[PDB]
Design a protein around this ligand. Structure first.
Ligand SMILES: CCCCCCCCCCCCCCCCCC(=O)OC[C@H](COP(=O)([O-])OCC(O)COP(=O)([O-])OC[C@@H](COC(=O)CCCCCCCCCCCCCCCCC)OC(=O)CCCCCCCCCCCCCCCCC)OC(=O)CCCCCCCCCCCCCCCCC
Ligand SMILES: CCCCCCCCCCCCCCCCCC(=O)OC[C@H](COP(=O)([O-])OCC(O)COP(=O)([O-])OC[C@@H](COC(=O)CCCCCCCCCCCCCCCCC)OC(=O)CCCCCCCCCCCCCCCCC)OC(=O)CCCCCCCCCCCCCCCCC
Ligand SMILES: CCCCCCCCCCCCCCCCCC(=O)OC[C@H](COP(=O)([O-])OCC(O)COP(=O)([O-])OC[C@@H](COC(=O)CCCCCCCCCCCCCCCCC)OC(=O)CCCCCCCCCCCCCCCCC)OC(=O)CCCCCCCCCCCCCCCCC
Ligand SMILES: CCCCCCCCCCCCCCCCCC(=O)OC[C@H](COP(=O)([O-])OCC[N+](C)(C)C)OC(=O)CCCCCCCCCCCCCCCCC
Ligand SMILES: CCCCCCCCCCCCCCCCCC(=O)OC[C@H](COP(=O)([O-])OCC[N+](C)(C)C)OC(=O)CCCCCCCCCCCCCCCCC
Ligand SMILES: CCCCCCCCCCCCCCCCCC(=O)OC[C@H](COP(=O)([O-])OCC[N+](C)(C)C)OC(=O)CCCCCCCCCCCCCCCCC
Ligand SMILES: CCCCCCCCCCCCCCCCCC(=O)OC[C@H](COP(=O)(O)OCCN)OC(=O)CCCCCCCCCCCCCCCCC
Ligand SMILES: CCCCCCCCCCCCCCCCCC(=O)OC[C@H](COP(=O)(O)OCCN)OC(=O)CCCCCCCCCCCCCCCCC
Ligand SMILES: CCCCCCCCCCCCCCCCCC(=O)OC[C@H](COP(=O)(O)OCCN)OC(=O)CCCCCCCCCCCCCCCCC
Lengths: 149, 116, 231, 120, 51, 93, 109, 178, 360
């Protein structure tokens, strides 16, 4: 299945495209994409920041406003100053979560867990022996969520 | 006369027994809890020295921190006994008779049971 | 952690593997050059004789007495209420005697220790002489325990509480057959393990195992009923 | 931390106290004490005290005591990194600064709720 | 009686806090941070219990 | 949770045994059956049970009257001479 | 848990890290050599230099997982094929859209 | 676990028991939310003693939700609480534990009477007043009512959809050793 | 480490710290919500209200939002099955699925709790902040790769639960006007605090002793190393002192029995339940069954499966004693919260029997 091109502003949407429902890979299992830096440091991940991570931050900022308003909808007995301060703190928290998501995306691109514009020389040959999802996804919305069907 | 491993395990369980053995006064139980934590502290130090493990020596300060937190909570709970009209000697907070107490005698707050 | 290890032992499998056998003789054979003290001290092997019925009865009584003493120490003595005057007299005795606590414990634990010893000895004799030749082992265990515990509760707790004693004996017999008589959670050999004899050729054994596998394929409901799609 | 020599010095301190005791007894030779009604009674500025054993305090600073326990524990935890700070790395530096930040946060929360003062 | 003089002259440690540092700040640092959070939350709970 | 450090900040005396045991366990398909030697070496380094059994046997044998006098030693030649030999610095001269 | 090769491989020494990029480079080279040979059994001695590089770069647990996965892949490739599996799964789903009536009055066993 | 000419045949799933345990815990949590969602919908101070199950005698929704939650807790089929006990007994039989089955049955029957004993207390001489008053009228929370509706659907007809939950839990438990 | 500090050692720790900082920033700024200085040049459109009782609906909504963000992080999570931060935590599929399941159930219960709190406000901000702290750290237990880190995580969770029990409302506004000039003595609060504190103390000291003696037995407390050493010992027959292994198993099991309040030690649980609000019972049951009892079972199933040769007999004895001890007691209670607690206890014993069948 196709993924949004990395280093664009929709590269963070590739985090929602998973070929298997597994959380993590095995110890000796090769990642889907070539490894750029397995021994990544914090500044290596920061240097690997790009438009995909910036777009993740922008998505957090855009969706964080209604979420902060929804949180504030339960606030009572509060002055305007405290209401504004609480909104600012919640919105900053959501934007910080977006920054964390962008950092995770950069780290994954470094480790090859998600798309990083690189492909292995020889792809892993897998036989889809057990297949309950191909026909379901080819006629539904979920073909956009599973990589390689 | 006993080896230190035997002595320290034995007296840790002896402290746990004595804590139950003594009358259930909250301050006394708090003191025995501190003593139990110190026994664990010494036993961890002994095993760390024997097996050359720095992780067992690490539990020395961790046990101190846990014991300090529990002691602070116990101090607060002991203070709380004052506002709930609860005796520190918890054996006096129930009407069940026991021969362990010389003077336990609780009576209804009434003068006369029968009016003529 | 095992129960009744010596009785629950596949002697054939243990011998084939070369594993030590608990049924091997545990005895001492002095030579005719040893001292008289060596001859006498070698007679302690009689205490290791599991076929000595007097020793077995004594040790079963000792185990029952230990259980009774433990019950008195933990659940029995503290439950019952001693009169205050009796306690005062006992503590006065402790005051005026150098080891009065030992005497107090002797007096308090004596009924429980004696009851445990008697129950253990009678139970061992009952099981060994009445029910060791029955075919249905589970049924024999259940019936024997039911009757024994009904009689015991009719005389140790209260005669009115004998139905509950019979039910508890049934449950205890089921538990004893499940774990003390059966190798559950105490398996000494792998499930499906076997030993080979006859000096059969490896080709012949492979052919026999192929035949067994062909028969094994009939245990699948899809294979037996012919409900498989063409793969 | 000392040793059996410290224990022996404690014994010698006890012997020095014995010397002071001898001097005090010798001084006791030089006076007479006359028995009087209120001589061996409690002093309360010239009048009899109305209480002997039941002299109870209010203890309004139990929060300060429990915070003292917790923060003494925290300072003990801070001791090792400061003892060997010359070998600090990124991890050790981050942990030390985060621990000090947690101590400061706990103190500030204690200040916000007015639990560091006396109560009625 | 055995003394390793090579390790002795290659050792610059001058205090007995080295295992404590290696524990609370290298390997058991997770439990060090956990104990810090525990003490913070315990202080908060102590304030709430006083209230 | 194996630190690998000694009480002076150095290296734990059983770290090579632990490393070899872990290497065998990761390499073998049946680590329990195959890493018995390395695991037993690590367990002997940790629990010195074999040395304690040796000490028990040595104490039992010293309770007997088999050995009277051990050979004395001199460092100048780095050698052991019999107790019966009248050398310098001897206890009995 | 003690019998789990994966859980034992996840264990590691303190301070032990895996250079996954180098490990997978060596693994790709060695497995490319092995697949070029294309034998029923993986004779690592027929690709000597790449075998040494794979041993040095990769850890024991990583190599154990790689060999187990290679054995599974070889078995699957000897057994199945893509179009056959696709047709089989399509037929299985189509049958799952129905019921399994019992085979009353059978002729076997 | 059989072997034929050095080839192992494995007809047993090792991770099935953990899935059954997870299903039992999840079913208990779902039924516990169902009983306590009805409680949180009402005046919480009205339920002090066991005889005060009469307080649930109100408009039919609260009454029937309470009685069906109690029946589900007791393990009465086909309610959600029955499925967990049935699967536990099935797995114990698969593991060949007749004594464990016997003790599970004893505990199940005693607890079942423990739960259904309170169904007698629900009978009240009149309809109860257990709702909080907001704006002079009883406060009925539609959100909690909808939650109870969903829980009641999955408690009544949850046996029809239990296969998917079993698949999910077995899939989750299959990662424990691989 | 020394030279390089890889991201893979704290990449999972980053979102947890982010949530912690957001939560505590909100909590700290909430404590000064009423401090808004009016300068001499400021005109008040309305007279300031100085009596405030803020509905904690916004706190619950913040908890839901941050738990949902953690769910989102878990959904997009990637990595290798390995141990991070000096092998004190494990990142594997089962542990991450347990984390996700715990967070999902916490989200459901928090949503229902918000819907309830909009009806009547009998709870404060501090109560839901304690709940916030529980939900943040209670899933971290399943990530423990060591009994040491597990012990410290459950110490933090127990402190949070004690905090939650502390902030329960004591006095209410009721239509009982007959008690205004008389002293009524309610002792449920002190009973709850006392029993929770002492059960926590006993469980903590027993778990500490078990950790100390497991370090002696193995030299490490990592789950994989403990299981490997114990299983190989059954193959080498090196450490044959069955007394020590049996006592370690007994200490661990009894400490967990005291912690969980499983029969025959359940009267303290009965006393605690009948002194807590129904919302507190809601959350406490959610945390107990999904986390504490689940880790109990996984200790007998996954973490210490190599010790099942000693676990089975202790578990069987405890199950039999509990079954034959509570059958009479469950029929002499007359309280709603006692009924709920005994329902929990009965289900716990049933699941203990189930795990006994599992470890077979
Ligand atoms: C080290 C162990 C720990 C030592 C310190 C313990 C401190 C307390 C711990 C907390 C629990 C307290 C429980 C209640 C209590 O005791 O209250 C205090 C109780 C009440 O205080 P009180 O009101 O002031 O009493 C006034 C008088 O002091 C009243 O004094 P009294 O004269 O009435 O009491 C004498 C006292 C002390 O008695 C002795 O010391 C007896 C010594 C001889 C024992 C028998 C021979 C042992 C041979 C050893 C070698 C064997 C080699 C192997 C052989 C083959 C084995 C198969 O004994 C007892 O109280 C009875 C205990 C059982 C006696 C032995 C039974 C043996 C059964 C078979 C095994 O005070 C005392 O008893 C005073 C001493 C303090 C308590 C000691 C308790 C020891 C119990 C264990 C047995 C020790 C001897 C045997 C060791 C080997 C066993 C296998
Ligand atoms: C009492 C009220 C009953 C009704 C209650 C209300 C109704 C509902 C409740 C359920 C009622 C049915 C209970 C059935 C229990 C399980 C029986 C079973 O499966 O046996 C397998 C067995 C088949 O296996 P097998 O390999 O052929 O075994 C034959 C030999 O036992 C194999 O060779 P062997 O060496 O084992 O042969 C010796 C064996 C040959 O067997 C016999 O002679 C009969 C054994 C039962 C005697 C019961 C006597 C009760 C009165 C005293 O004899 C003995 O072991 C000693 C016999 C004398 C026993 C004296 C002590 C009695 C203690 C008090 C009663 C305890 C009841 C425990 C129930 C446990 C349930 C789990 O089937 C039977 O034994 C037939 C069932 C009927 C047995 C006799 C029943 C007499 C009362 C009828 C009342 C009708 C109403
Ligand atoms: C492919 C061909 C298929 C052909 C058909 C095959 C069979 C279909 C599936 C049937 C499965 C049934 C399984 C047994 C469930 C029993 C549970 C129970 O007692 O529920 C009570 C529950 C009604 O409780 P209630 O007495 O109304 O309670 C009063 C309210 O609580 C308070 O009342 P309120 O006035 O306050 O509020 C009213 C509100 C109360 O709100 C609620 O109760 C909330 C939950 C439902 C929300 C509405 C539906 C949302 C979607 O709504 C209701 O009370 C209505 C509840 C639903 C009744 C549906 C009746 C027709 C069957 C529909 C089956 C749908 C399956 C999916 O359902 C029934 O009594 C249904 C009747 C019995 C079953 C259908 C008739 C027999 C059909 C053949 C059965 C063969 C069985 C084979 C083995 C099956 C097990 C392995
Ligand atoms: C209900 C029935 C309960 C049991 C009834 C009595 C059984 C024993 C009868 C007396 C003989 C006896 O005990 O013989 C067995 C043995 C005989 O002594 P023995 O040890 O020489 O036995 C050798 C083996 N047989 C039995 C084949 C001869 O005695 C005992 O077990 C002693 C019992 C009392 C111990 C105190
Ligand atoms: C250096 C320590 C020297 C101690 C010398 C003895 C102290 C002494 O006499 O104490 C006075 C006390 C009491 O002595 P006293 O009762 O004779 O003191 C009264 C003294 N005049 C007569 C001068 C008023 O003596 C004793 O306790 C006994 C002394 C040893 C005999
Ligand atoms: C036992 C210790 C006291 C033993 C006293 C009687 C035996 C004795 O002294 O023998 C001395 C004699 C030895 O006497 P010796 O004369 O060889 O003493 C040493 C003399 N110079 C210093 C010159 C070397 O025997 C022993 O010492 C044998 C062993 C004694 C016990 C150990
Ligand atoms: C033709 C069509 C045209 C278009 C039609 C219209 C549009 C259609 C839109 C379709 C839907 C779009 C969905 C968009 C993304 C949604 C993401 C989501 O919901 O994820 C759920 C999550 C994903 O699971 P997974 O990825 O496997 O987990 C992480 C693994 N690394 O899964 C999980 O978190 C699983 C958690 C498992 C553990 C908990 C659950 C099992 C146990 C409890 C059972 C239930 C009991 C109650 C629990 C509480 C319920 C509130
Ligand atoms: C959950 C728990 C799981 C437990 C699993 C195992 C259950 C069954 C255990 C049975 C043990 C037993 O009784 O074994 C029999 C034993 C003799 O064994 P053996 O010599 O091998 O037998 C030869 C065959 N006949 O004989 C004995 O052990 C003798 C003692 C057995 C009977 C004891 C009776 C009670 C003793 C204390 C009584 C106290 C009374 C107090 C109240 C009254 C006070 C006045
Ligand atoms: C629930 C679980 C509880 C227990 C959790 C235990 C683990 C907690 C997480 C530990 C995370 C450690 C992260 C260290 C910080 C970091 O990496 O900062 C980045 C940078 C160093 O980057 P680096 O690439 O290593 O350096 C170039 C050399 N190659 O660093 C720097 O440039 C600065 C140095 C590091 C930070 C120093 C202290 C700053 C302030 C700390 C917080 C104060 C409040």
């Amino acid at each position: 299945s196709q993924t949004f091109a990395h280093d664009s502003f929709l590269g963070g949407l590739n985090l929602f495209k998973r070929r298997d429902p597994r959380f993590v890979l095995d110890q000796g299992e090769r990642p889907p994409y070539p490894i750029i830096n397995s021994n990544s440091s914090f500044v290596d991940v920061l240097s690997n920041f790009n438009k995909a991570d910036f777009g993740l931050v922008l998505f957090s900022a855009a969706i964080g406003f209604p979420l902060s308003r929804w949180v504030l909808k339960g606030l009572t007995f509060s002055s305007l100053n405290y209401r504004r301060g609480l909104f600012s703190s919640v919105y900053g928290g959501v934007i910080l979560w977006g920054l964390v998501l962008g950092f995770n995306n950069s780290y994954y691109r470094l480790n090859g867990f998600v798309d990083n514009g690189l492909v292995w020389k020889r792809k892993e040959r897998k036989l889809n022996k057990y297949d309950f999802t191909s026909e379901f996804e080819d006629n539904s919305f979920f073909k956009k969520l599973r990589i390689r069907d | 006369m006993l080896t230190w491993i035997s002595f320290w395990s034995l007296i840790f369980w002896l402290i746990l027994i004595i804590l139950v053995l003594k009358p259930k006064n909250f301050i006394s139980i708090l003191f025995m809890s501190e003593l139990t934590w110190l026994a664990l502290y010494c036993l961890s130090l002994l095993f760390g020295a024997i097996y050359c493990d720095i992780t067992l020596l690490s539990i020395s300060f961790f046990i101190l921190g846990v014991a300090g937190l529990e002691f602070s909570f116990g101090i607060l709970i002991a203070i709380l006994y004052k506002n709930l009209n609860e005796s520190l000697n918890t054996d006096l907070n129930n009407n069940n008779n026991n021969q362990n107490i010389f003077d336990k005698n609780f009576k209804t707050p009434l003068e006369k049971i029968n009016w003529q | 952690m095992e129960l009744n290890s010596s009785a629950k032992e596949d002697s054939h499998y243990v011998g084939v593997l070369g594993y030590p056998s608990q049924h091997d003789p545990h005895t001492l054979h002095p030579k005719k050059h040893d001292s008289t003290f060596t001859k006498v001290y070698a007679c302690r092997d009689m205490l290791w004789d599991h076929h000595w019925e007097v020793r077995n009865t004594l040790y079963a009584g000792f185990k029952g007495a230990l259980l009774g003493v433990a019950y008195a120490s933990g659940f029995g003595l503290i439950s019952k209420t001693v009169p205050s005057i009796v306690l005062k007299k006992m503590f006065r005795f402790v005051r005026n005697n150098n080891f009065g606590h030992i005497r107090i414990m002797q007096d308090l634990l004596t009924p429980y220790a004696l009851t445990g010893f008697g129950l253990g000895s009678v139970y061992y004799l009952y099981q060994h002489n009445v029910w060791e030749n029955r075919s249905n082992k589970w049924l024999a265990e259940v019936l024997s325990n039911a009757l024994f515990f009904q009689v015991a509760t009719a005389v140790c707790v209260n005669p009115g509480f004998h139905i509950y004693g019979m039910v508890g004996g049934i449950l205890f017999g089921t538990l004893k057959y499940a774990f003390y008589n059966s190798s559950f959670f105490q398996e000494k050999e792998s499930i499906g393990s076997y030993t080979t004899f006859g000096d059969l050729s490896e080709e012949e054994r492979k052919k026999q195992e192929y035949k067994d596998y062909i028969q094994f394929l009939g245990n699948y409901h899809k294979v037996r009923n012919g409900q498989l799609v063409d793969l | 931390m000392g040793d059996a020599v410290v224990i022996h010095l404690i014994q010698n301190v006890l012997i020095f106290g014995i010397i002071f005791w001898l001097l005090t007894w010798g001084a006791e030779y030089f006076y007479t004490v006359k028995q009087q009604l209120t001589k061996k009674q409690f002093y309360e500025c010239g009048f009899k005290s109305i209480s002997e054993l039941n002299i109870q305090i209010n203890f309004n600073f139990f929060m300060l005591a429990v915070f003292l326990i917790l923060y003494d524990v925290e300072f003990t935890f801070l001791f090792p990194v400061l003892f060997n700070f010359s070998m600090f790395s990124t991890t050790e530096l981050f942990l030390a600064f985060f621990f000090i930040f947690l101590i400061l946060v706990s103190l500030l929360y204690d200040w916000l709720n007015n639990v560091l003062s006396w109560s009625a | 009686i055995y003394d390793d003089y090579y390790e002795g002259f290659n050792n610059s440690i001058m205090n007995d806090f080295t295992p404590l540092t290696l524990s609370y700040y290298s390997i058991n640092s997770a439990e060090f941070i956990i104990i810090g959070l525990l003490l913070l939350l315990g202080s908060v709970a102590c304030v709430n219990l006083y209230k | 949770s194996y630190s690998g450090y000694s009480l002076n900040g150095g290296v734990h005396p059983c770290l090579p045994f632990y490393e070899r045991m872990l290497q065998c366990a990761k390499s073998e398909a049946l680590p329990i059956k195959m890493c018995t030697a390395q695991t037993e070496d690590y367990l002997e380094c940790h629990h010195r049970k074999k040395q304690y059994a040796l000490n028990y046997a040595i104490k039992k044998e010293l309770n007997n009257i088999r050995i009277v006098a051990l050979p004395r030693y001199d460092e100048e030649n780095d050698t052991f001479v019999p107790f019966s030999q009248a050398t310098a610095d001897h206890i009995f001269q | 848990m003690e019998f789990s090769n994966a859980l034992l491989s996840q264990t590691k020494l303190p301070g032990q890290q895996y250079d996954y990029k180098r490990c997978f480079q060596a693994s790709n080279t060695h497995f490319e050599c092995l697949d070029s040979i294309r034998d029923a059994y993986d004779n690592h001695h027929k690709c000597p230099q790449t075998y040494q590089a794979w041993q040095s770069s990769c850890d024991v647990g990583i190599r154990r997982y790689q060999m187990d996965n290679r054995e599974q892949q070889k078995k699957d490739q000897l057994l199945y094929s893509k179009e056959q599996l696709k047709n089989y799964n399509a037929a299985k789903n189509k049958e799952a859209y129905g019921i399994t009536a019992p085979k009353n009055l059978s002729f076997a066993f | 676990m059989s072997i034929f000419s050095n080839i192992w045949i494995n007809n047993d799933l090792n991770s099935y028991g953990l899935s059954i345990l997870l299903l039992n815990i999840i079913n208990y949590l779902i039924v516990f939310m169902l009983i306590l969602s009805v409680i949180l919908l009402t005046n919480l101070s009205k339920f002090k003693s066991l005889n005060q199950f009469k307080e649930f005698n109100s408009y039919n929704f609260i009454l029937y939700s309470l009685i069906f939650s109690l029946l589900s807790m007791a393990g009465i089929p086909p309610l959600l609480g029955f499925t967990g006990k049935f699967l536990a007994i099935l797995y114990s039989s698969f593991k060949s534990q007749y004594l464990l089955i016997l003790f599970m049955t004893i505990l199940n029957i005693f607890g079942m009477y423990f739960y259904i004993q309170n169904l007698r207390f629900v009978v009240k001489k009149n309809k109860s007043s257990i709702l909080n008053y907001k704006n002079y009228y009883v406060n009925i929370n539609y959100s909690i009512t909808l939650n109870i509706i969903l829980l009641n659907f999955f408690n009544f007809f949850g046996i029809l959809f239990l296969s998917d939950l079993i698949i999910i839990l077995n899939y989750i438990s299959s990662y424990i050793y691989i | 480490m020394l030279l390089r500090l890889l991201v893979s050692e704290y990449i999972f720790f980053l979102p947890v710290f982010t949530n912690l900082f957001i939560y505590w920033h909100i909590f700290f700024k909430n404590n000064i919500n009423l401090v808004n200085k009016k300068n001499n040049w400021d005109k008040s459109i309305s007279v300031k209200n100085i009596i405030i009782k803020q509905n904690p609906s916004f706190i619950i909504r913040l908890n839901l939002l941050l738990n949902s963000l953690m769910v989102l992080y878990l959904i997009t999570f990637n990595g290798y099955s390995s141990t991070f931060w000096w092998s004190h935590f494990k990142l594997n599929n089962y542990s991450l699925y347990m984390y996700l399941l715990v967070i999902i159930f916490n989200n459901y219960f928090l949503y229902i709790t918000e819907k309830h709190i909009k009806i009547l406000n009998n709870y404060s901000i501090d109560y839901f902040f304690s709940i916030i702290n529980i939900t943040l750290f209670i899933p971290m237990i399943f990530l423990s790769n060591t009994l040491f880190t597990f012990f410290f995580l459950i110490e933090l969770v127990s402190c949070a639960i004690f905090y939650k029990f502390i902030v329960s409302k004591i006095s209410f506004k009721n239509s009982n006007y007959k008690d205004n000039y008389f002293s009524i003595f309610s002792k449920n609060y002190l009973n709850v605090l006392f029993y929770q504190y002492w059960s926590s103390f006993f469980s903590s000291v027993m778990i500490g002793f078990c950790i100390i003696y497991l370090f002696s037995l193995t030299g490490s407390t990592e789950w994989s190393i403990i299981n490997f050493i114990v299983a190989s010992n059954n193959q080498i027959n090196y450490y044959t002192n069955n007394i020590t292994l049996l006592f370690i198993c007994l200490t661990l099991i009894i400490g967990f029995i005291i912690k969980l309040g499983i029969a025959p030690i359940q009267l303290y649980k009965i006393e605690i339940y009948k002194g807590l609000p129904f919302l507190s019972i809601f959350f406490y049951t959610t945390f107990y069954f999904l986390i504490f009892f689940l880790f109990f079972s996984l200790l007998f199933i996954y973490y210490l499966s190599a010790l099942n040769n000693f676990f089975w007999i202790i578990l069987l004895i405890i199950s039999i004693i509990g079954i034959f001890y509570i059958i009479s007691i469950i029929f002499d209670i007359n309280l709603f919260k006692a009924f709920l607690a005994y329902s929990t206890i009965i289900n716990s014993i049933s699941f203990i029997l189930l795990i006994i069948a599992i470890i077979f």
